[PDB]
Every structure is written in structure tokens, then in C-alpha cells.
Amino acid sequence: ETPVLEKNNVTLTGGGENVTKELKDKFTSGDFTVVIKYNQSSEKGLQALFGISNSKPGQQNSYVDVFLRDNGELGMEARDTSSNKNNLVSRPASVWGKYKQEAVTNTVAVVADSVKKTYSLYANGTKVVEKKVDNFLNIKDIKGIDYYMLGGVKRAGKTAFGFNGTLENIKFFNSALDEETVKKMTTNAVTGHLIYTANDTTGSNYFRIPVLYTFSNGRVFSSIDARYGGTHDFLNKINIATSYSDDNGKTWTKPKLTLAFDDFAPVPLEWPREVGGRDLQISGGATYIDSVIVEKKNKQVLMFADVMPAGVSFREATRKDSGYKQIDGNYYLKLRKQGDTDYNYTIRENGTVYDDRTNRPTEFSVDKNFGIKQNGNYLTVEQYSVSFENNKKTEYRNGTKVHMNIFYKDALFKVVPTNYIAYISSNDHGESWSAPTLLPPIMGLNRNAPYLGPGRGIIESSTGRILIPSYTGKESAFIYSDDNGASWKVKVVPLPSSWSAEAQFVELSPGVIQAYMRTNNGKIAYLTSKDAGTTWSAPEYLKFVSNPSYGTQLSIINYSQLIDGKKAVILSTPNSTNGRKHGQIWIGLINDDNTIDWRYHHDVDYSNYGYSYSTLTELPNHEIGLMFEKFDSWSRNELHMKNVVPYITFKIEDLKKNL
């Protein structure tokens, strides 16, 4: 309940402060909790917030500490020289470094619990890790502890891991405080930058692929992947969740599930992060993934997403079948009934399922949310849950009956196991949505649908054409409507190599459009159209971004206000050959000849901090909103982490840097 020691406002420059006299032998049980509110003046090197050690020659592997790395990783050590027990518990991407040129105040904590044999670490309101270890050490288990310090570890008479910064408040407790208390204690201004959080109203512990859009009524809208079984692209269960703000991004609605299947329950799952287990996946729930948003000229809002039947992955999907038949000039989604070899059925007018062999209606039908009926009554299946008690994953039928659905593995009639694109519409700026509409097979009957480029669509100003970015793995696929979204066509552009070409558009001048996109060669590519997306140039490449060959998604938007007398675009991307890190926001000024002068940039946090997928929007007051993956979402070391997708705002003056 009350600390054995509390200190305030201790500024350090790598030297530490001895507090041995104020801690000596105060950890009676040997358990501990230490809560540290701090900021770093420099991020370089491994830095300890505190160190409790045997400082004598030869005992340099007898200490407890909590530490920070230059990549945002928070960890702790607990080591005993004589028994050769060496415990290290941590999670990447746990803290923030700097924000708009200034040191961020974080609050972190460590709890050591002898009865549970666990070490737990907390950062800004989140329990980032709790790990049971066989070789558990408490302070009494480490022999001859004799030195207690702030801002380093005393090892063989010298200070190691010197902290550079201010310890604004540090509290030491001689017991293991409970989780709700410590979450509360660590909650601060950083916590308020999370819109989506682990086990909120989505039920997901994990999130990826954020998207931001500002509507013409001033509402700021966000969408994201709620990924339940860790952060895996596949196999997984994924829903699209949404949340909005009516006050310029200051406060946000409780998240809602907007696109969601219910073959698997949306539940918080503890996905393992060890080298064995982290590769584990569920068997696969039907999935929506990778959202794109656009507002039409009439103020209707459209959201697109990829749709995946349960158990099917992007890599295994058949690329030789659209999942449609053409019968009497119309495109009908086709179905295979359990036990049949061929696809003998189609969904036709009113959702009536026809037997294509006899060309007559069956007693079965499919509603607009893909649920299956027989004689006007719904068929049901049992929903699955996943549990992880210790180390063993189990999937089981959970007692809930849900509507049978053509995307589920337990359905009597099933779609082709490939990918599809769906869209929904809203007439109330995101408060409610229509039932989904599957795109027709615009790639051809014998090709799979494209994969969407997460972010936004645009309306080209001179023609009114709606453009939706997508890709196939070998080509760009620019999806478009010329009839205000009643029907859809595609422009397919072959690419120099097999890019995962996630793309976004900007308009330079009336009729002139650029598509900026991810590649497999380390650069960001851009293609240019001078006829509103009908024809496209060969790729050009940005000169100042150099990334790994796998690449990352980007965000680029038009900005409404003049910067230095010029129309501007704003770009967000990682920029680093060592991983998804060194996030930058760039400002491009459109020249008279429609080339771009990339004149300014701002680094988002320090350069070794993680930065993956991102999304930009212009707020109603002309500030900029950014939401991004503040971690490396490619790296096998940073999978399955909670509360790592923050929202932040910038004034143009915050971005106009590095001339």
C-alpha cells in the first residue's frame, strides 16, 4: 500500500545516485514493485532506471534492474552469480522516446511475485509482459546485495548502464502490488493516445492496419484490423473495428465491430511470444482484413475490405477461380454443397440458391449478410472458441448457435476458397452501415479478386471518378467507378517485379493523379496518369527513402492549405534499411510543372524506434492526424504485442523541419 521509498525530480547525466542508506534491507519478503515516472534526455545505450546489486569485485552478475534500449524496448534482469541463474524478461516497443522535439514522460513498473514465480512489466497503463520463470529470483535470493542506486547498476565498484534523464517520481514497494493498481499507477498522457486497446469493446488483444478519414461534416473517422489470434496476417480471426471523433480528434467513441463474422467468438487471447509458440495460428475464422474508406460527392461513405473464408490464406488461395459463374449474362456467386465435387449451385435473384444442373430454385436461400436459410428458416452451426491455458492451444465448440454462413468451414454450401472484396455504405457518417456487397469478378471469371491497398480512396476532381487502390502480386489494380459508385471497373497495370503494391493516390492538378506504392526493391514507387487514371506511366522512384526489400505500406494525402505559397502533399513511411523503423512525415510542394519538391520532414520519435503501417488525415482545423503501428510488424521478434497503435496530431509548424 505505501512505498518503502519515494523520490521526486532527480535529474541525472549517467552518474546515478546512491540510495543504499534509504533502501538497505527494507525488502523483508524479497518481493518488490518499483514504479518509475521518467523522461530520457538521451536514448543511446542500454540504460537502467535503478539497480540493486552486490557491488563487490566478482559479484557483477548479482543484481536486479529495469532497463530501456534505444528502440523503445523495456526489460528487467534478475541475476545471482553463485547459483548461475540469469532471468531476463522484456517486450519491444514498450515506451516512447521523443514527441515533437521533446522528451516524453513515461511511467513504467516492475512486479516480482514469489508465490507465482512471475516477473511483470508495465508501461503507460499496459501490462506489457508477465512471465513465469523456473529459475526465479527475489531480492533475498540474490546473495550479498549491498548497493541500491538510481539511474544505473553498481557492478564491481563501477556504475553500469548509466541513465540520462529525469526520474520525476520513483516509488519502491517491498511487496508485489496487484495488476489493477499498477495499471492505474502507470496511466498517464501517453495512455490517452490509444484509440483501440487490448480487450476493449472489440474483445481483441491485438490490432494492425489503422486508417483515418475526415468527412465533410468535420467528423474524424478511424478503422482498423482487430486481430484476435496474435497479429498474424493468417491464419487468424480478423474483424474491422471503427471509432470516431466529433471534436478534432480530442475524444473518440468506444470501438464497435463494423465488419465481423461470428464463426469464432471475438475474445481476448494470450498469444505466446516465445521462439516456438509465436508461430502458432488458429485453424482460421472467416475474415475481413485491410480496409479502404472514401466519402462520395453525395456524402455517402463507403468502406471496402478483403473477405477470406475460414481457413483460407492469401498464399494458399486459388488464383484461377473468381468464385463466380456467368449465367444468362449475369454474374452469380457459386456454391459447392457438402459431398459434391463440383460447384453445382448459384445465388440468384433474392438470394435464392439455384441448382445449375436443373436450372430451378432449391429450398435454400442466402440473406445479404451471407447467412443460409432452408424454407425461410435459418440453419445454424456452433461457434468456436480458442483457449490458451498454459502452453497448449485448444479450439472447441462453445455452446453458442450462430447462423450458418457461406464463408464458414461448417457450412452446407460453401464459396470457392479464394479472396473476395466487399463494401458497405453509410448515410449517417459512420453511425450505421448497410449489409455488405461483394464486388463482381472484375479481374475475369478465372482470376481471384485483387487485394486492397489499405488507406483511403479518392474522387478525381475534373471527372468525378472514384478510385480505389489494389494489387494482385504482379500488377497494380486501380478499381474505379464513373457512375458515382453504382458499378465498378478496373485498370490493370503490369509491374517491373512481384510487388506487394499497397498504394495510395494524390491529385496534383485537375486530371493528373499519382499512385505511390510499396515495392520489393527497397524504394517507394510512383506512377503518373494525365487522363484521370485511364493510362499510367512507367514507375519512378523517390530518391530519399531506402527500405528493406519486403517494404512497408505508406500513407499520402493532399493537404487543403498552401505551404510556402504552394499546394502540398503529406507522406508518412518508415525510412531505414534495418527494419520497419525511423518513421518520417514528409511535405512535398507541387511545382508548376507537377513535379514535387520534397522540402521538409519530421522524424516521428528516434530512429531505432519501430514504425510500420500508417495513415494520415487532414483534421477540420487544418492540423494533421496520424495513426500508426509503433513497432516493427514484419519482425518475428515483435509479433503479438498489446497497445502499440497510437494516434497523434501535428500542426504544420511541427512538420516544417529539416529544410
XYZ file of C-alpha atoms in Angstrom, residues 20-525:
506
model
C 21.725 2.481 -0.277
C 21.104 4.058 3.097
C 17.420 4.634 2.184
C 16.775 1.079 0.907
C 19.161 -1.213 2.794
C 17.424 -4.481 3.902
C 13.951 -2.960 3.505
C 12.765 -5.776 1.169
C 11.800 -8.093 4.040
C 9.852 -10.714 1.974
C 12.087 -10.252 -1.051
C 9.179 -9.380 -3.379
C 9.166 -5.968 -4.974
C 7.331 -3.448 -7.069
C 9.063 -0.356 -8.471
C 7.057 2.367 -10.265
C 9.108 4.935 -12.213
C 7.832 8.100 -13.919
C 10.691 9.360 -16.068
C 11.856 11.057 -19.247
C 15.117 10.442 -21.241
C 17.432 13.366 -22.325
C 19.299 10.808 -24.473
C 18.129 7.386 -25.785
C 21.587 5.896 -26.601
C 22.858 2.735 -24.963
C 21.254 0.322 -22.521
C 20.092 2.450 -19.548
C 18.973 1.272 -16.088
C 16.326 3.231 -14.160
C 17.515 1.603 -10.934
C 19.932 -1.112 -9.816
C 20.028 -3.252 -6.711
C 23.299 -5.176 -6.585
C 26.138 -6.873 -4.879
C 28.753 -4.204 -5.846
C 31.795 -6.255 -4.719
C 34.530 -7.489 -7.149
C 33.464 -10.854 -8.644
C 29.730 -10.354 -7.919
C 28.852 -8.370 -11.082
C 26.186 -10.989 -12.061
C 24.269 -10.412 -8.822
C 21.690 -7.693 -9.465
C 18.102 -6.685 -10.178
C 17.356 -3.844 -12.676
C 14.831 -2.351 -15.080
C 16.224 -1.017 -18.358
C 15.477 0.847 -21.558
C 17.035 0.298 -25.025
C 17.268 2.841 -27.880
C 14.401 1.051 -29.696
C 11.708 1.514 -27.045
C 12.235 -1.941 -25.523
C 11.599 -2.145 -21.779
C 13.122 -5.030 -19.809
C 14.306 -6.270 -16.418
C 17.103 -8.541 -15.197
C 17.301 -10.637 -12.055
C 20.616 -12.466 -11.694
C 22.543 -14.365 -8.962
C 26.252 -15.030 -9.560
C 26.687 -18.157 -7.370
C 23.603 -20.179 -8.469
C 24.149 -19.000 -12.133
C 20.502 -18.039 -12.505
C 20.033 -15.303 -15.125
C 16.482 -14.101 -15.707
C 15.655 -11.575 -18.486
C 12.047 -10.534 -19.140
C 11.071 -7.799 -21.708
C 8.952 -6.596 -24.603
C 9.925 -4.465 -27.608
C 8.221 -1.204 -28.358
C 7.016 -0.578 -24.789
C 7.919 3.104 -24.277
C 8.082 6.362 -26.235
C 11.261 8.365 -26.777
C 10.519 11.846 -28.066
C 7.426 13.645 -29.344
C 7.519 16.972 -31.266
C 11.185 17.673 -30.339
C 10.628 16.968 -26.557
C 11.329 14.120 -24.194
C 8.233 12.025 -23.491
C 7.317 11.389 -19.874
C 6.667 7.617 -19.459
C 5.593 5.649 -16.405
C 6.868 2.057 -16.158
C 6.866 -0.609 -13.424
C 8.221 -3.970 -12.424
C 6.490 -6.507 -10.111
C 8.316 -9.603 -8.739
C 5.929 -12.151 -7.159
C 7.499 -15.119 -5.312
C 4.336 -17.187 -4.836
C 3.591 -17.028 -8.615
C 7.303 -17.055 -9.622
C 6.490 -14.258 -12.152
C 8.097 -11.045 -13.284
C 5.645 -8.487 -14.718
C 6.449 -5.216 -16.606
C 4.109 -2.258 -17.116
C 4.389 0.805 -19.454
C 1.897 3.689 -19.659
C -1.122 1.742 -18.414
C -0.383 -1.528 -20.196
C 0.959 -4.736 -18.635
C 3.385 -5.354 -21.500
C 4.609 -8.765 -20.221
C 4.157 -11.269 -17.378
C 6.458 -14.321 -17.497
C 6.740 -17.354 -15.152
C 10.404 -18.499 -14.864
C 11.721 -21.726 -13.258
C 14.918 -20.024 -12.006
C 13.009 -17.211 -10.242
C 14.956 -14.806 -8.045
C 13.653 -12.320 -5.462
C 15.927 -9.778 -3.698
C 16.626 -12.145 -0.794
C 17.560 -14.968 -3.232
C 20.444 -12.805 -4.595
C 23.373 -13.060 -2.174
C 25.113 -10.166 -0.570
C 23.040 -7.340 -2.072
C 24.796 -4.219 -0.722
C 24.202 -1.300 -3.151
C 20.911 0.290 -4.142
C 21.046 3.019 -6.801
C 19.010 5.276 -9.082
C 19.949 5.548 -12.740
C 22.457 2.672 -13.015
C 23.735 -0.652 -11.636
C 26.799 -0.808 -9.372
C 28.892 -3.731 -10.703
C 32.388 -4.386 -9.252
C 32.630 -0.817 -7.878
C 31.682 0.958 -11.203
C 28.339 2.303 -12.461
C 26.922 0.376 -15.400
C 24.040 1.261 -17.687
C 24.021 4.962 -16.809
C 20.590 6.585 -17.153
C 20.405 10.004 -18.898
C 17.229 11.875 -17.953
C 14.951 12.874 -15.069
C 13.273 10.496 -12.660
C 10.201 12.644 -11.993
C 8.832 10.166 -9.375
C 10.117 6.778 -8.308
C 8.488 4.520 -5.760
C 9.880 1.281 -4.290
C 7.494 -1.172 -2.602
C 8.507 -4.308 -0.649
C 5.596 -6.381 -1.937
C 4.026 -7.476 -5.203
C 1.277 -4.921 -5.955
C -1.826 -6.150 -7.856
C -2.295 -5.634 -11.572
C -5.196 -3.109 -11.466
C -3.284 -0.926 -9.037
C -0.150 -0.869 -11.170
C -2.080 -0.263 -14.420
C -3.701 2.661 -12.681
C -0.367 3.943 -11.363
C 1.293 3.795 -14.773
C -1.610 5.510 -16.631
C -0.648 8.976 -17.949
C -0.858 11.306 -21.040
C 0.656 8.623 -23.326
C -2.217 6.248 -22.481
C -4.703 8.730 -23.988
C -3.148 8.325 -27.478
C -4.573 4.793 -27.865
C -7.949 4.663 -29.581
C -8.086 0.864 -29.689
C -6.854 -1.062 -26.644
C -6.498 -4.685 -25.606
C -9.867 -6.196 -24.588
C -11.853 -3.028 -25.163
C -15.316 -3.212 -26.795
C -13.826 -5.167 -29.785
C -12.724 -8.094 -27.488
C -9.356 -8.263 -29.341
C -5.983 -8.101 -27.633
C -4.256 -7.014 -30.882
C -4.627 -4.533 -33.728
C -2.985 -3.684 -37.037
C -3.599 -1.599 -40.208
C -5.067 1.635 -38.968
C -6.967 4.027 -41.304
C -8.029 7.660 -40.752
C -10.513 9.735 -42.769
C -12.062 13.161 -42.206
C -15.653 13.558 -43.512
C -17.111 16.803 -44.982
C -19.207 17.380 -41.798
C -15.978 17.650 -39.629
C -16.156 14.099 -38.126
C -12.805 12.276 -37.849
C -13.264 8.560 -38.589
C -10.944 5.607 -37.932
C -10.929 1.931 -38.844
C -8.543 -0.881 -38.018
C -7.935 -4.660 -38.046
C -8.919 -6.297 -34.756
C -6.654 -9.376 -34.906
C -7.675 -11.934 -32.235
C -5.101 -14.745 -32.524
C -1.972 -12.632 -32.294
C -1.013 -10.179 -35.099
C -0.618 -12.813 -37.847
C -1.951 -11.818 -41.327
C -3.087 -15.522 -41.496
C -4.328 -17.935 -40.362
C -6.302 -15.868 -37.867
C -9.607 -14.340 -36.998
C -9.853 -10.625 -38.071
C -12.727 -8.098 -37.820
C -12.779 -4.425 -38.963
C -13.458 -2.188 -35.925
C -14.282 1.561 -36.053
C -14.247 4.582 -33.796
C -14.855 8.319 -34.476
C -14.336 11.781 -33.021
C -16.580 14.831 -33.276
C -14.061 17.237 -31.608
C -10.986 17.297 -33.843
C -9.522 14.056 -32.534
C -9.567 15.034 -28.844
C -12.081 12.247 -27.786
C -13.123 9.034 -29.536
C -16.161 6.717 -29.356
C -15.881 3.271 -27.778
C -14.865 0.967 -30.623
C -17.553 -1.012 -32.481
C -17.268 -4.145 -34.630
C -18.331 -2.947 -38.079
C -17.321 -5.905 -40.309
C -17.327 -9.163 -38.370
C -18.145 -12.831 -38.813
C -19.252 -14.928 -35.860
C -17.990 -18.478 -36.589
C -15.386 -17.750 -33.907
C -16.057 -15.695 -30.821
C -14.249 -12.279 -30.610
C -12.307 -12.911 -27.386
C -9.096 -11.764 -25.735
C -6.408 -14.383 -26.364
C -2.925 -14.586 -24.759
C -0.790 -15.346 -27.801
C 2.625 -16.831 -26.918
C 5.715 -14.780 -27.833
C 8.491 -17.409 -27.429
C 10.505 -18.711 -30.392
C 8.436 -21.953 -30.504
C 4.933 -20.793 -29.862
C 4.867 -17.398 -31.664
C 4.379 -19.159 -34.996
C 1.182 -20.798 -33.777
C -2.002 -19.859 -35.534
C -5.611 -20.828 -35.054
C -7.291 -23.093 -37.594
C -8.848 -19.920 -39.084
C -12.062 -17.960 -38.678
C -13.784 -16.233 -41.577
C -12.026 -12.883 -42.024
C -12.265 -9.258 -43.042
C -8.895 -7.549 -43.408
C -7.302 -4.350 -44.901
C -9.887 -1.540 -45.003
C -10.226 1.341 -47.537
C -12.526 4.362 -46.950
C -13.864 7.117 -49.236
C -16.669 9.715 -48.988
C -18.719 10.206 -52.193
C -19.736 13.604 -53.637
C -23.264 12.987 -52.207
C -21.793 12.466 -48.632
C -22.427 8.704 -48.539
C -19.396 6.906 -47.048
C -18.057 3.638 -48.477
C -15.810 1.166 -46.667
C -14.100 -1.687 -48.623
C -12.336 -4.743 -47.155
C -10.800 -8.080 -48.235
C -13.022 -11.115 -47.352
C -11.469 -14.536 -46.601
C -13.363 -17.727 -45.953
C -12.438 -19.566 -42.767
C -9.169 -21.468 -43.020
C -8.060 -19.903 -46.328
C -4.828 -17.832 -46.505
C -3.636 -15.312 -49.114
C -0.711 -17.566 -50.124
C -2.818 -20.772 -50.461
C -5.862 -19.164 -52.146
C -6.629 -20.334 -55.665
C -5.812 -17.656 -58.197
C -7.568 -19.474 -61.081
C -11.217 -19.075 -59.963
C -13.142 -15.844 -59.139
C -15.825 -17.764 -57.240
C -18.440 -16.592 -59.802
C -20.371 -18.187 -62.732
C -21.852 -16.309 -65.681
C -25.432 -17.496 -66.382
C -27.701 -15.683 -68.865
C -25.293 -12.668 -68.933
C -25.237 -12.216 -65.092
C -22.517 -12.842 -62.512
C -23.702 -15.125 -59.710
C -21.640 -16.229 -56.735
C -21.310 -20.011 -56.942
C -21.552 -22.644 -54.191
C -20.472 -26.217 -53.564
C -22.770 -28.359 -51.448
C -21.063 -30.679 -48.910
C -20.238 -34.037 -50.542
C -20.218 -32.696 -54.127
C -17.056 -32.448 -56.208
C -18.251 -29.612 -58.488
C -19.822 -26.212 -57.833
C -23.415 -27.018 -58.864
C -25.251 -24.045 -57.282
C -25.566 -20.231 -57.637
C -27.107 -17.463 -55.580
C -29.514 -15.598 -57.907
C -32.339 -13.022 -57.518
C -33.464 -12.501 -53.884
C -30.717 -14.762 -52.543
C -32.460 -17.848 -53.950
C -29.991 -20.685 -54.426
C -30.430 -22.432 -57.791
C -29.239 -25.861 -58.841
C -27.389 -25.009 -62.092
C -27.774 -28.583 -63.415
C -31.618 -28.373 -63.443
C -31.761 -24.557 -63.541
C -34.510 -24.444 -60.857
C -34.692 -22.863 -57.360
C -33.859 -25.079 -54.373
C -35.436 -24.695 -50.964
C -32.265 -22.830 -49.832
C -31.509 -19.144 -49.807
C -28.779 -16.752 -48.621
C -29.517 -13.391 -46.925
C -27.499 -10.166 -47.629
C -25.207 -10.941 -44.661
C -24.301 -14.343 -46.197
C -26.469 -16.465 -43.812
C -28.122 -19.625 -45.097
C -31.844 -20.438 -44.916
C -33.871 -23.526 -45.730
C -37.621 -22.978 -46.393
C -37.286 -19.466 -44.922
C -35.757 -20.755 -41.624
C -32.128 -20.126 -40.672
C -29.713 -23.050 -40.443
C -27.276 -22.880 -37.547
C -23.817 -24.071 -36.630
C -21.984 -23.998 -33.357
C -19.472 -21.162 -32.802
C -15.824 -21.875 -31.903
C -13.734 -20.548 -29.063
C -9.951 -20.694 -28.600
C -8.241 -21.030 -25.229
C -4.585 -20.995 -24.128
C -4.396 -22.238 -20.516
C -0.569 -22.877 -20.075
C 1.248 -23.689 -23.299
C -1.460 -25.733 -25.110
C -3.827 -24.167 -27.711
C -7.309 -25.755 -27.927
C -10.180 -24.888 -30.285
C -13.657 -26.072 -29.220
C -17.370 -25.690 -29.958
C -18.632 -23.267 -27.268
C -22.410 -23.705 -26.937
C -23.389 -20.613 -28.977
C -25.537 -21.259 -32.117
C -24.961 -18.776 -34.936
C -26.425 -18.526 -38.395
C -24.779 -20.917 -40.836
C -22.806 -18.800 -43.354
C -21.341 -19.466 -46.807
C -17.872 -18.293 -45.610
C -17.683 -20.782 -42.681
C -15.956 -24.144 -42.597
C -19.067 -25.817 -41.161
C -21.467 -24.627 -43.892
C -23.624 -26.943 -46.028
C -22.963 -24.692 -49.033
C -19.552 -23.073 -49.423
C -17.874 -20.449 -51.589
C -14.718 -21.041 -53.604
C -11.786 -20.875 -51.133
C -10.228 -17.666 -52.519
C -10.206 -13.982 -51.628
C -13.015 -11.508 -52.327
C -13.613 -7.769 -51.900
C -16.706 -6.434 -50.151
C -18.087 -2.968 -49.454
C -20.582 -1.345 -47.122
C -22.164 2.160 -47.246
C -23.212 4.661 -44.588
C -25.647 7.577 -44.961
C -25.018 8.909 -41.434
C -21.248 9.392 -41.499
C -20.363 6.070 -39.928
C -23.010 5.624 -37.205
C -24.747 2.814 -39.117
C -23.951 0.743 -42.191
C -25.629 -1.265 -44.927
C -25.245 -5.027 -45.449
C -22.108 -5.918 -47.488
C -21.945 -6.152 -51.294
C -19.321 -8.440 -52.874
C -17.571 -6.868 -55.817
C -18.290 -8.652 -59.142
C -15.412 -10.610 -60.745
C -13.842 -7.524 -62.377
C -10.494 -9.337 -62.824
C -12.189 -12.019 -65.009
C -14.071 -15.210 -64.119
C -10.836 -17.211 -63.917
C -8.838 -14.871 -61.622
C -9.096 -14.131 -57.889
C -10.159 -10.633 -56.711
C -7.467 -8.039 -56.065
C -6.043 -7.256 -52.630
C -6.868 -3.791 -51.303
C -4.197 -1.145 -50.530
C -5.163 -0.041 -47.007
C -5.944 3.641 -46.507
C -8.304 5.846 -48.492
C -9.828 6.137 -51.946
C -10.227 9.429 -53.771
C -12.612 11.291 -56.062
C -10.756 12.784 -59.028
C -11.938 16.419 -59.274
C -12.383 17.030 -63.068
C -14.348 13.824 -63.928
C -15.777 12.743 -60.553
C -14.287 9.268 -60.945
C -13.979 7.265 -57.665
C -10.612 5.453 -57.386
C -9.843 2.534 -55.035
C -6.266 1.210 -54.873
C -5.498 -2.527 -55.017
C -2.865 -5.011 -56.307
C -2.552 -8.670 -57.447
C 1.032 -9.533 -56.591
C 2.264 -8.855 -60.160
C 0.179 -5.856 -61.219
C -1.413 -2.733 -59.858
C -5.205 -2.855 -59.938
C -6.879 0.544 -59.840
C -10.565 -0.102 -59.117
C -12.896 2.696 -60.351
C -16.456 3.861 -60.866
C -17.620 6.521 -63.339
C -21.258 6.363 -62.188
C -20.973 7.567 -58.572
C -20.361 4.034 -57.257
C -23.213 2.140 -58.889
C -20.846 -0.077 -60.910
C -17.129 -0.844 -60.831
C -14.353 -1.373 -63.346
C -10.612 -1.927 -63.107
C -7.430 -0.650 -64.773
C -4.713 -3.336 -64.564
C -1.065 -2.203 -64.903
C 1.762 -4.765 -65.012
C 4.755 -4.027 -62.754
C 8.567 -4.479 -63.135
C 8.584 -7.217 -60.469
C 6.316 -9.039 -57.968
C 5.496 -6.065 -55.697
C 3.059 -6.222 -52.794
C 1.916 -2.929 -54.293
C -0.166 -1.368 -51.499
C -0.889 2.066 -52.957
C -2.425 5.472 -52.235
C -3.406 8.330 -54.616
C -2.895 12.081 -54.757
C -4.196 14.630 -57.278
C -1.565 17.158 -58.429
C -3.745 19.221 -60.716
C -7.168 18.572 -62.472
C -6.978 15.218 -64.283
C -3.392 14.450 -63.082
C -3.025 11.653 -60.464
C -0.118 9.814 -58.835
C -0.185 6.369 -57.226
C 2.558 5.960 -54.630
C 3.257 2.352 -53.627
C 5.262 -0.316 -51.834
C 7.724 -2.366 -53.874
C 10.029 -5.369 -53.416
C 13.184 -3.363 -54.375
C 13.568 -1.154 -51.240
C 12.222 2.067 -52.824
C 8.833 3.759 -52.888
C 7.454 3.836 -56.426
